[PDB]
Curated annotation (Swiss-Prot):
Keywords: Lipid degradation, Lipid metabolism, Lyase, Secreted, Signal
Function comment: Cleaves glycosylphosphatidylinositol (GPI) and phosphatidylinositol (PI) anchors but not PI phosphates.
GO molecular function: phosphatidylinositol diacylglycerol-lyase activity; phosphoric diester hydrolase activity
SUPFAM superfamilies: PLC-like phosphodiesterases (SSF51695)
TM region positions: none
Location (main, coarse): secreted
Name of the protein described by the UniProt record: 1-phosphatidylinositol phosphodiesterase
EC number: 4.6.1.13
Amino acid sequence: ASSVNELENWSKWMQPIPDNIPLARISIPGTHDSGTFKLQNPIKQVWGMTQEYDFRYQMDHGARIFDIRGRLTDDNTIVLHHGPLYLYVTLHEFINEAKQFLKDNPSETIIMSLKKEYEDMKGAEGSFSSTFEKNYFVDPIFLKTEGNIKLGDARGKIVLLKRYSGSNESGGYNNFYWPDNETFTTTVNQNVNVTVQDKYKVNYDEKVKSIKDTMDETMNNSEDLNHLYINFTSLSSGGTAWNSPYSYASSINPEIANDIKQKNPTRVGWVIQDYINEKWSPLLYQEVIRANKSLI
Ligand SMILES: [Zn+2]
Ligand SMILES: [Zn+2]
Ligand SMILES: [Zn+2]
Ligand SMILES: [Zn+2]
């Protein structure tokens, strides 16, 4: 009952992929700084807005990886931030939206990257890691196993990608050294080789070339099941209308999407983008999802 066209149902595209395929092998669309969609102040937007729509919109369009940046509060909760700015979005808000999506579409999995974005507030009873584990992670929705996580074990659950230190509970992908503004390679869950392109503050041409170089590598290493490729197409703000995350995404998203469309590869990696929407064609997240055709 599995056909390649089933990859076209953006809310259930992982359904046709076999249970035994490692998530690392699947080409998955993701959203950079996922919770910035509520920013209204034009000054806050030009500097930190990276998405126009909420979490469910993102998921219904195919996004399965979410970049969550939070801050520990005096209430022993974690809220979403962009630097010192509160995004009016909370961690529980994201998880609840993910729970709803997973309930409605049990064939899917949601990968949640969690990073400490700003200094803990005074008054918290514990640490960022201990508070997350005690008040959020205990929830059954979170996958508690590790290794080269397979889709079958992830269906209906949230798979954690730690970007914070001090973890004391098993589950998801372990935290690893993440050099600043670079393309680097390292290892994670004992047997998973990881390559990340996260040059968030390089010049535009350098960014475009870096995305392409890393994707070219991914396309020619399609059978490497234990290799994880994370490719951020997002680029940090210059503080003006002509160099905001939106202006950059308007050209980068269609450019990279065309690369995939023209090459028609069997793997392109975990592509984390800014502004998932239907304004620019070809649509990046759709071409990324379509690159899983050979897995069916
Ligand atoms: Zn309080
Ligand atoms: Zn909401
Ligand atoms: Zn490898
Ligand atoms: Zn739409």
